[model samples]
Target: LGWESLKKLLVFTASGVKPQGKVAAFDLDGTLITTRSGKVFPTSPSDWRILYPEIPKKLQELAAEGYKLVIFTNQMGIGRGKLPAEVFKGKVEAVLEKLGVPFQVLVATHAGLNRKPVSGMWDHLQEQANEGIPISVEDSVFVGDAAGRLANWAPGRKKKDFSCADRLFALNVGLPFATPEEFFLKWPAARFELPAFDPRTISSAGPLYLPESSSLLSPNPEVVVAVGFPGAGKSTFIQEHLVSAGYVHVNRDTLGSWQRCVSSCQAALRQGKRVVIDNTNPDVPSRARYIQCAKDAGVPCRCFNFCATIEQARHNNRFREMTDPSHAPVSDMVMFSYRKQFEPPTLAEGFLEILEIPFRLQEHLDPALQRLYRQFSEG
Candidate 1:
């Protein structure tokens, strides 16, 4: 379905929930406190300071209007071995105490699927409010800096973007700012104009056939896997082509580990890095989890299929082992065994392109395979 249709569906479904007054959910970190090299301090109690001093007052006004305040946050730093979970929790409690907000709920998660973009936290919040916590999606709103970071609720579906305090005032009170000083000088009444989109100015070219659009299907940038059989030469092709093309290559066998490849890829993606998974992804089910990762990240995903004869693969595998002792060795039997499990990419697999690199161009590479490749590329 199109985005508009999907949005309508969400709105309708969320609206069906009973109105829980003026419930408001605020994101921690960039949305609330002024971070100095990554630490938060309160402006004062009963008047929690944010980028804008007026946010607390505005939230107070909403509270007076019968709104229940809640903080929904994703703290992945705990899983990364950075900050301790209790410290993060303590910071949150301090902020709340300073605000005197008496929030209905304060939810946070480190791992096991309670993080943002998963809706686990929100689910928990609703579950806690068992008596049908009457909060319709329209009556309730989420405010945050990076919509992409808010995974629980739909990203970019916030009532306002508060990267700047003045922007928040303008949204809440409809005041215009002449300059940065003027905005800071007068807490409320910071005004803003809606940005316009001009379609005529966009370029129409290349694979997408048009400039970037919200509707374009993209894989998650965090984790992606290159799947093929043992003889498929996934490692060689990735090391030569993709690694030099600004991608970090992770080979399953080379890592001498599994179970966490997905998480590793996610870490790289979060750092805004391109990652290529070098594995003999032989079947759809084997690679489905990785594809889901890409879909979640909303980045372009592609697969390259390296084709070579049995003799050619054997020769290459042996030569590489002899030349480079560090290179993993693969026997002819192992190669044949992997080939038996090879499951070629299909259109339903959600690959943007399935590039077939033949040992040599031929007229008889299987018409069915050619048709599949063409369909994937064209669509």
Candidate 2:
């Protein structure tokens, strides 16, 4: 396809930007279709019948309520030689045709850089439909099956531990459906009310960190420090996973480098912005100073430790040094020093909570590792 034609298609599928409001983006696989034995059914097209009867009607109702529907899906089978690219496109077209409802946009990433958890696909969608779109991240909702993918859409690398796809649908669509029957049994008037939040600003702050009893309007502000060792992909993790997932990311290393970064971040926070510090903070004393800074600023503090094995850290360090001659060489003595100075976060560290990312095992076929592989693949 020509670039212009492709752009038009993307704009059509992405629901070109409208003033930001409540928009519903659906995950195609398990959220909409059930796999049988080894068979993969097409969930994107309307030509293929949804095994669950209530889904179509519920989606129809959502469309009628002024909610923009978009489909964001990952089709890795295409890259594995199990499915053809043309077939995948056809399937998506069929679904839109069958629904008799035009989706604002239909995003399909075939194990490429734009795939789920990467945010490139979402970024493309947003750019195509920039005008009139709500400017907030909270105004948008992403529904998907995989925990890793969902984590990409959540605030600050924090995974939504519960699997409530149905509840999520009800919350966004404004109805409770225990079963297909229950969904159809309830009339449009019987739909439940969605929790109040501004749709125009959903994508603005990363994630909402607050106590269960606290209101969104509460004056209490918080500072979160996302910590991990050097070469643990802390910057990538924060930018791709946390910031894209919705938190305002502040790189502390940038602050230390020029004095301006920290001042700009602190200024924003002082004006009531929710900020997260993305820094390689393995030192206990250094982290303690950050904790005090947050406290003095009248904000809550939390630390997320992206832990990795020594081997992985060494590998990353070696790669960096080789790639850039100006890079400092990580010597054995420096390694030892870091190991000696490293202090694991504890419950009493002025942190409201501590989240840990376990060491990534290269030998295993874990979903998390698979996600990384898929990100770099072109097809």
Candidate 3:
């Protein structure tokens, strides 16, 4: 009878439920259950039934084997106000009672870390809700319908899986994953595809900039112009490498406008201090403003073009949102706008050198952050 709510999640435990180490985790819609009316989505609170005849029996068997039965469902409808919390709570209660097995339900009310495929809820299950019991990944399994299967993956299901969130969630949590058909009905495993951008492929080792041997610091005070998408690690790279090396950071975000940023750069250069322009200088005109500032100050201007593609920038943005709660998220529109406006920097643009700044994994980043970076945050 216990139901708890939070900013982004809701938790419910039946009267006699107990937390345990070995978890039999599952997705709710299209996995353990489906719409009773043969609709893709439930039309009402009570419009549901067990997905397969074998699901209830299998869940009971797992519970008897000392596994904690849990449901991790992404119910964004609740957060979006499309579905009332009371109606969904009653639905879950009804489903659990029908299964006749004690269950602990973790409902992700909105997107973010708690959303499926991110492993936020599973991490919470271990760190907070599991009652000091260390969950064993080796023994646990997660079943869900959204296994990234293509169209006609099975005989009757013609459409593709909506999203790979469920399968990716299992991968992120290090749990063996199975589709509902495979887990409950003993269907043979079907082929599935993972997201193209896998985090594991990123290597921490690499040259920070190219042509492999460019000098970062100049003997004379200079202006460094930055060019990239919003979440392309431009600010971090500049702050760490240039600012730390005595360069003045001139950012529009801090100064409030391009005029102010230019003035700030001119002032910093007048003082013979090196200046790094920390804005998404996408078009030729934006870069020209800083280049002109360098010309007036009689200092050579260099370009640092961050080599992160749009996809990588989005991934990094999502990573920051998860690990750094205080961070303001960059919307996709801003990213696309940069992409549309971006003109590649060149020595022809009056720059002494064009430096290619690769997105190298930072050495100081902890293992958890590294592992998170390596995962497929998208899809």
Candidate 4:
């Protein structure tokens, strides 16, 4: 029993555990159960115990009132190769047996939009796993122990809840939320603050360009390069802005490495096609190689700066994730990897011109223009 076996166990029936559109989703480790021995997680599947005696009774009461009981959990160990999926499945079945309720379970094996603080897991719950139940937004609720609160938010001896992922998950799905202590034992719900990063409030502004700037209106180039985060719309800009005017596109994703892309850029420039190096040149050290490419070719280098605004880049990445599967989706964990090293382009880098280009939502994109193609073919 490994990954495949564990997945087979999760397959539920159409009529097996019919959802009532209302759900009472819970977090496992800290919410409904705890370890039999006293370390953070159980040593093995058998090494677990309940957090409260009233767990089963309350869950049974909810089911009797016609509500779905579900569990959404994060098990990084599965992806990290620390915990076998079979071991996790074994623990889940045992837990269900103890609780004695008809329940649905969702385990995010690794970090991504599917993990808490994002809506991927909940979307799977609503669309595919709920036996086609149309979840009621107002009636559904989530209970987890990870609501980020000051220690005093609860009458506890110390510390805030470690992560706000649980609370954020409920919020992202538009469901009501509470702590396990509050839901199970009738304890007071703690007063908590909002999570540090909230995706719901995200909105993107169109690219900002100076109207009166003396920069060339139609800045033709020998070596024009892009610098930004992974999903920063580099490919789209070249196709729309440069390729229309006959510029050659050289990319790392196709060339396999920056070194290869650099050589390709030199080759294209030598052949007299104005070249656009559309890769995420995040820092001065990386950009130096491309800038040097133009210098050696007796050509001017223009920097098309795709600003790495965290919120904007994330917004664009999520869109590509659902609409396009041709390219591997960029996870939030990896989005911020090279972001910290991002240096904004400037004239000091020997760039003849630096153009700031932001991102856009497809709905807002003007359909009147054909070549006004989205910055990403992702959509």
13-82, model 1: which lDDT tens digit per residue?
Answer: 1211223544566666666655543334333222334566766676677677765666555555655657
Model 4 local distance difference test score: 0.72
lDDT of 3 by residue, 1-379 (tens): 5999976989998887888879999999989888989998788888899878887889889999999999999998989999999889999999998999999999999867888888889988899898989999999999998889988888887888888989999998799999988988899999888877776676678787998777977767999998888778888888888878888998766677889989999999989898899999999999999999999989899999998888888988988888887678889998998898989998888999999998887743587776666666655
Q: Write the per-residue lDDT of candidate 2 for residues 53-149, one digit (tens) a residue.
A: 6767777777777667766566567656676666666666655565566565544434333444444455555565545564344555555443222
User: Model 3: how far is 368 from its true place, Å?
Assistant: 4.0
Ranking by lDDT: 3, 4, 2, 1
Candidates in order, TM-scores: namely 0.37, 0.38, 0.94, 0.79
Query: CA lDDT of each candidate?
Result: 0.50, 0.52, 0.87, 0.72
Clashes of each: 15, 30, 1, 0
**With candidate 1 superimposed using the best TM-score fit, by how many Å does residue 249's alpha carbon deviate from the native?**
26
In terms of TM-score, the best-performing candidate is 3
- What is the TM-score of candidate 3? 0.94
Can you tell me which runs of candidate 1 are displaced by over 4 Å? 1-22, 36-49, 148-379
Best by lDDT: 3
Task: Return the TM-score for candidate 2, rounded to 2 decimals.
Answer: 0.38
Clashes of 4: 0
Better of 1 and 3 by TM-score: 3
Clashing residue pairs, backbone N/CA/C < 3 A, model 3: 199-374
- Alpha-carbon RMSD, candidate 2: 16.5
